[model samples]
Target: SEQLKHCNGILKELLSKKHAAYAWPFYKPVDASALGLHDYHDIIKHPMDLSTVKRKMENRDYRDAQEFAADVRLMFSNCYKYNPPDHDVVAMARKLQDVFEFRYAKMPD
Candidate 1:
């Protein structure tokens, strides 16, 4: 496959260990209707999630690994954009992002 082997392994492990209620919200695409967040669509135009990341990676949609990273960052940024700073998910996104960055930084240079 032409996909990124190291990146796949990194995300695979990260998602495995980090899968929990806190991270559950980001597992799939958001459903504003179910969550009663009517204004969500207005604030976050391009919603992203781990599932979308996995699919894109599987499809080899990116020209490079950095594009994959951008979508991950976008997911977290979307969380922050719609939710208040003190929102539980807001901090969760930050922590998750930190963890992602930690693993990403260890990649081969």
Candidate 2:
């Protein structure tokens, strides 16, 4: 439970930083446009869907772990106004679904 809470906190911080550029409004339209595209594709692509992240985490593979962390960052970076599934409020639901499934369904016996 502590690990899950810690990871959630870390993830929240990471996502906030990743989307800060788009959220802050100082960035130009050209730069901002990329946020929509980035967020769109990132949400659709499930890094753990391929079992890569789970396998790496399971095996204690730091290289893949680092890579997966980056991918996770990329995934959350798309949480902006222009991104598809435009509801910023509910945008996190999908990833939270994944997290819930991963944590509870995949828990050790």
Candidate 3:
């Protein structure tokens, strides 16, 4: 129980730090008819709401280390969708992965 609380606290801190960046608007590539590009992917771009994620983590009852890792990965993946090419985000994700492994991987089933 204590381990779950500790892990959750770490995740919450990371999420809060990331929330500011996530709140910023993303600039998608604009399609110009003059260039004959009819792609409308930008029209359907769905930005992730960090508040929802924050609530989820806050209310979640993680049953195990694996479940906790899944939630962490889900948050990382959502951010990755919008920042696929951002080296900084990638590095952060890797760091989170290491944190998860180090903190939870050794826990008993």
Candidate 4:
């Protein structure tokens, strides 16, 4: 119970302090397109991945940053399996691809 409480504490601290960039406010379930923003797939991918990983590594006491890496990867994988087919989905996917590409191909290690 103590360990579980500590774990929850860590999770809460990490979430409360999460960077604004990691948020997908623009990707709200209501009307992302109406807001003139891109899709979820795009927003969730590369930049999000790098930023989230860096932040988690910097902020949280997780076993490692690699855990965040796996988490983000799995999120997108599941999205593809569950999300509906649509132009927005494609656009979001492209955004995610760009995020990853920029992180790997452009950004420094």
- State which candidate has the highest lDDT: 1
The digit string of per-residue lDDT tens for model 1 on 9-32 reads 756865775546467778899999
**Quick one: best TM-score, which candidate?**
1
lDDT of 3 by residue, 1-109 (tens): 5666766665555445454353222112223465363543453353333354355557775665566666566555655654456557566555655655565655543
Where does candidate 1 have its weakest 10-residue lDDT segment? 13-22
- TM agreement with the true structure for every prediction: 0.90, 0.28, 0.45, 0.38
Q: Cα RMSD (Å) per model?
A: 1.9, 12.8, 7.5, 10.8
State candidate 3's TM-score. Answer: 0.45
Better of 1 and 2 by TM-score: 1
Between 3 and 4, whose TM-score is larger?
A: 3
- Scored against the true structure, residue 89 in model 1 reaches a CA lDDT of 92
Look at candidate 3 and tell me the lDDT of residue 52. Answer: 46
Q: How do these models rank on lDDT, best leading?
A: 1, 3, 4, 2
User: lDDT of all predictions, in order shown?
Assistant: 0.81, 0.40, 0.51, 0.43
How many collisions per candidate?
A: 0, 1, 0, 7
* lDDT per residue (tens digit) for residues 30-88 in model 4: 24368564664454343333334445545654464345436545545544554566746
lDDT of 2 by residue, 1-109 (tens): 3444343443444335555533333211223255554553434443222233334445645443235545444334433323457664335535543553354434333
